[PDB]
Amino acid sequence: GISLANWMCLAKWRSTDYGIFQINSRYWCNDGKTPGAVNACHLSCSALLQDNIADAVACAKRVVRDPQGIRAWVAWRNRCQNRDVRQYVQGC
Amino acid sequence: GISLANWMCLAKWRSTDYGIFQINSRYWCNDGKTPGAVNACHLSCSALLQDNIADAVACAKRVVRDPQGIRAWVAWRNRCQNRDVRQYVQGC
Amino acid sequence: GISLANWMCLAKWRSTDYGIFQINSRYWCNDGKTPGAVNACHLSCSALLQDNIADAVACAKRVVRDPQGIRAWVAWRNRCQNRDVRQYVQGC
Amino acid sequence: GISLANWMCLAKWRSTDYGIFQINSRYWCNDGKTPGAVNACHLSCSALLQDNIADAVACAKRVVRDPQGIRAWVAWRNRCQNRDVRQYVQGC
Amino acid sequence: GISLANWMCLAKWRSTDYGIFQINSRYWCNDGKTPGAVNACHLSCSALLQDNIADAVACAKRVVRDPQGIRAWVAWRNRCQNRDVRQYVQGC
């Protein structure tokens, strides 16, 4: 992931030292984010998958999906209609 | 994940030292986020999956999904209609 | 997850040292977040799944889903209609 | 992932030293991002997959998908129509 | 991934030294990005896949997809229509 380290040492027989660390930080910003909007989809025998990860830091993900065995998807004579469909997405 | 360490040491026989760490921090910001809005979908024999992770830090996720055995999805003569469908998504 | 450490040491035979750690913190901000809004969906023989994690720190998740054995989803002659459907999502 | 280290040392028998680290940080910015908007799709026996990762730092992802065994997708005489469909995406 | 290191040393028997590191940072910018908008697609027996990675730093991804075994996709006499379909994408 992330590893930081900061050291100082001295010996004897003025000083003003600075360490400033700023990784994912935001200052005076107007951030905005709008991932993954879905509208008016028709799914008959179908899959939709989304990872809408908006801001992760040092995050870990592990996935196993459908290792083994029969999948059958069958469709016939289905009727799907979208009419006058509008999507406005404005992550301003 | 995230590992930080800070050390200081001295020996003898002024000083003013600073350590500032700012990882995912937000200062004076106007952050806003709107992940994963879904509208008016028709699912017949269908799946929709979303990870709308908005801000995680050092988070860990482990998933196993449908390892083994028969899946069958069957659909016929279904009628699905959308009419005058509008989605407005505005993560300002 | 997250590990921090802070040390100081001295020996002999002024000083003013600082350690400031600010991980996921928010200062003076106007944060807002609106993950995962769902509207007017038709699920016939269907699944919808969402992880709307908004702000987690150091969080851990472990999942197992449908390891084994028959799934069958069957639909016929179903009628689904959406008419004049509007969704407004505004995570300002 | 990310590794940083900072050292200082001295011995004897003024000084003001600085270390500034700014990795993924944003200052005075008006950032905005809008990944992965989906509108009005028809999926008969079909898959749609999206990774809408908007801002990750040091993040790790591991995936296994459909290792083994029969997939069959069958569709016939399906009718799908889109009429007067408009999408506006404006990540300003 | 990314490795930084900073050292300082002295011995004896003024100084003001600076180290400024600015990797993926943005200053005074109006950045905006809008990857992967999808509109009005018809998928019969088909797959659509997107990685809409918008801003990753030091991120790692590993994927295994469909290692082994029969895939069959069959479609006949399907009718798909798009009419008056307009898409506007404006990552200003």
Residue numbers in the entry:
A (entry chain E), B (entry chain G), C (entry chain I), D (entry chain C), E (entry chain A): 22 to 34, 50 to 128
Task: Copy out sentences from the published article reporting this entry, exactly as the authors wrote them.
Here we go beyond the mesoscopic polymorphisms of amyloids from human lysozyme and HEWL, providing unprecedented evidence at the atomic level for the different folding motifs in the irreversible and reversible amyloids derived from a single protein sequence, by combining atomic force microscopy (AFM), cryo-electron microscopy (cryo-EM) and solid-state NMR. By combining atomic force microscopy, cryo-electron microscopy and solid-state NMR, we show that a full unfolding of the native protein precursor is a requirement for establishing irreversible amyloid fibrils. In contrast, under the longer heat-treatment in the presence of a reducing agent, native lysozyme undergoes a complete unfolding, which allows it to fold into irreversible fibrils, with twelve and ten in-register inter-molecular β-sheets for human lysozyme and HEWL, respectively.
Disulfide reduction and extended heating at 90 °C is sufficient to fully denature human lysozyme, allowing for the formation of heat-irreversible amyloid fibrils. Using standard single-particle-based helical reconstruction techniques, we were able to produce an initial de novo 3D model from the 2D classes which could then be used for refinement of the irreversible fibril structure of human lysozyme to 2.8 Å resolution. The structural model comprises residues 22–34, 50–128 and an additional 12 residues whose sequence could not be identified, covering more than 2/3 of the amino acid sequence of human lysozyme. Apart from a region of tubular density which could not be modeled due to its low quality the remaining 1/3 of the protein, including the segment 35–40, is not visible in the cryo-EM structure, indicating that these segments are dynamic or heterogeneous in the structure. The amyloid fibril structure is composed of twelve in-register inter-molecular β-sheets (β1: residues 23–32, β2: 51–58, β3: 62–63, β4: 68–69, β5: 74–75, β6: 78–79, β7: 83–87, β8: 96–101, β9: 107–112, β10: 115–119, β11: 120–125 and a 7-residue β-strand of unknown sequence composition). The β-strands are often bordered by glycine residues (i.e., Gly22, Gly68, Gly72, Gly105, Gly127), by prolines (i.e., Pro71, Pro103) or β-arches. Further typical structural motifs of amyloid fibrils are present and include hydrogen bonded glutamine/asparagine ladders (such as the buried residues Gln86, Gln123, Asn60, Asn75, Asn88, Asn118). Furthermore, a complete unfolding of the native lysozyme is necessary for the irreversible amyloid formation as the sequence elements of both the native helices as well as the β-strands of the anti-parallel β-sheet of the native protein fold are incorporated into the amyloid fibril structure.
